[PDB]
């Protein structure tokens, strides 16, 4: 009977809220509501240990920078996220989110999460990327970002298809349980 706290951060509309709702409610919300501040709970079992998981959802938008530090205080593991369909989204990993996290949550383990795996092989997505001379994200550099930012590990998922979502929260829990 152990409690752990997780905070999810990443750019606006990169799939932070949806990933929590799918995991906690097991349904995907269809209307987009930009998060200001939201609180969720979920239960999971990992390696024969029972864990309550508080999900702290944060705002990716700039206007709410000032509210975000209020979710950081007692964090056991951070889910740092980016979208695979947004390539500007990963350059914000080392330029905004890592600095922010390491400042408010030092030595607290970080999981790097790639969101919207379903949109890799979606034709409608790749065509709009070309207009900015850009292409979707592969798993090698994801791995690299993670090695570069001293992340605990690395994960790809899809909230729409439900693919690999629980696999995310297992590592997050192992991270919190470890040390």
């Amino acid at each position: 009977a152990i409690r752990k706290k997780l905070v999810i951060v990443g750019d606006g509309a990169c799939g932070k809220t949806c990933l929590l709702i799918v995991f906690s409610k097991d349904q995907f919300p269809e209307v987009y509501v930009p998060t200001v501040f939201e609180n969720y709970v979920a239960d999971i079992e990992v390696d024969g240990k029972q864990v309550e998981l508080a999900l702290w959802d944060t705002a990716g938008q700039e206007d709410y920078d000032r509210l975000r530090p209020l979710s950081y205080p007692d964090t056991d593991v951070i889910l740092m996220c980016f979208s695979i369909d947004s390539p500007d989204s990963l350059e914000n990993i080392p330029e905004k989110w890592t600095p922010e996290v390491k400042h408010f949550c030092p030595n607290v383990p970080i999981i790097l999460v790639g969101n919207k795996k379903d949109l890799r092989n979606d034709e409608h997505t790749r065509r709009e990327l070309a207009k900015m001379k850009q292409e979707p994200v592969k798993p090698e550099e994801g791995r690299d970002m993670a090695n570069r930012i001293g992340a605990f590990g690395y994960m790809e998922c899809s909230a729409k298809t439900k693919d690999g979502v629980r696999e995310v929260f297992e590592m997050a829990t192992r991270a919190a349980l470890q040390a």
Binding site: R3, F37, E38, N39, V41, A54, L55, L67, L70
Partner: protein, 360 residues
């Protein structure tokens, strides 16, 4: 005793069981209205008029006790006489729905709730004053003993006679309900009583509401005398500094009660919080004082403006909820407040969300 025992066994001769049981309930309404009017006239004659004549207290203090007794009496007199006017055309009373609307619907409804409100609003405060006035003055205690021993009161004290209006307004809905129980369903009559019944509950709510509001205004007055906002003059927190000379009296109270404040890890503080129209003020108690302080971990402001907060539920704790202060000019903050029970948490949440919406 019964309606059946009055009128005659000759007169009930040709009537169904439903019609009789219906007459029994209607009669109860008529008879108890006659009692209530008389109770009001006892108040008038034995208390109000004697106090007026004999100058037992100042005029404004007496007007507070019985603000509009003559007018209240006029209401139940005109209604009672219309009942009696109905009885004139035979002991079997027929269509009665038109009578009930004439008192609980439209203008009538407006008239009744205004007067009853004004008569009951301050009453609990006035009665307490009367109780204290009796310990203060020999001369007043003598009068109260004289008046309560009067035959017309039939061994009842002031407190019992005066509360009768509320008792009466709280009885109207149950009394209609029984009439509706014994009315032919799907007639014009049936629907109209339902309409009358519904408005009785509205009037009930309206009057209880005004009592609730007046009692709140009076509680704030009290709280203002015990308020120590001294620490707010030393400022430092720009939001707290606004409320160095607060004054609760200028606002209405929505809700109040004890919440434990989770200021930190293994640091708690018991508060008594007030929900007002525009503000949430967090109050700490010494003895009889109500403190406004800042409280350290950079400090928290004891007063939050509702037009600059967010309300959220703690998902791991169904007792606790967050208030997030989003006021500019200072760093934003998380107030984690714990309620007594889960049901109490829901009551706070509900009233909080409503007040924030109306503020914004």
């Amino acid at each position: 005793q019964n309606w059946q025992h009055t009128v005659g066994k000759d007169v009930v001769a040709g009537l169904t069981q439903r019609e009789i049981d219906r007459q029994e309930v209607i009669n109860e309404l008529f008879v108890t209205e006659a009692s209530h009017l008389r109770t009001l006239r006892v108040l008038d004659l034995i208390f109000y008029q004697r106090m007026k004549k004999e100058n037992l207290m100042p005029r404004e203090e007496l007007a507070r006790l019985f603000p509009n007794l003559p007018e209240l009496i006029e209401i139940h007199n005109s209604w009672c006489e219309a009942m009696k006017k109905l009885r004139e055309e035979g002991p079997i009373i027929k269509e009665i729905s038109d009578l009930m609307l004439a008192r609980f619907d439209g203008p009538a409804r407006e008239e009744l709730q205004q007067v009853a409100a004004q008569f009951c609003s301050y009453q609990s405060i006035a009665l307490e004053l009367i109780k204290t006035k009796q310990r203060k003055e020999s001369r007043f205690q003598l009068f109260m003993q004289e008046a309560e021993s009067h035959p017309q009161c039939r061994r009842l004290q002031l407190r019992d006679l005066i509360i009768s209006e509320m008792q009466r307004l709280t009885k109207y809905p149950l009394l209609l309900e029984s009439i509706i129980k014994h009315t032919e369903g799907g007639t014009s009559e049936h629907e109209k009583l339902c309409r009358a019944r519904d408005q009785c509950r509205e009037i009930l709510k309206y009057v209880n509401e005004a009592v609730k509001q007046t009692e709140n205004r009076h509680r704030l007055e009290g709280y203002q005398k015990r308020l120590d906002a001294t620490a707010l003059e030393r400022a430092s927190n720009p939001l707290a500094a606004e409320f160095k000379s607060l004054d609760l009296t200028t606002r209405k109270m929505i809700h109040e009660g004890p919440l434990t404040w989770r200021i930190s890890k293994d640091k708690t503080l018991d508060l008594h919080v007030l929900l007002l129209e525009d503000l949430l003020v967090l109050l700490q108690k010494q003895d009889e004082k109500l403190l406004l302080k800042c409280h350290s971990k950079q400090t928290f402001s004891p007063v939050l403006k509702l037009n600059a907060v967010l309300i959220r539920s703690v998902a791991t704790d169904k007792r606790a909820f967050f208030i997030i202060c989003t006021s500019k000019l200072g760093p934003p903050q998380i107030y984690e407040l714990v309620a007594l029970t889960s049901s109490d948490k829901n009551t706070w949440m509900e009233l909080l969300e409503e007040a924030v919406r109306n503020a914004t």
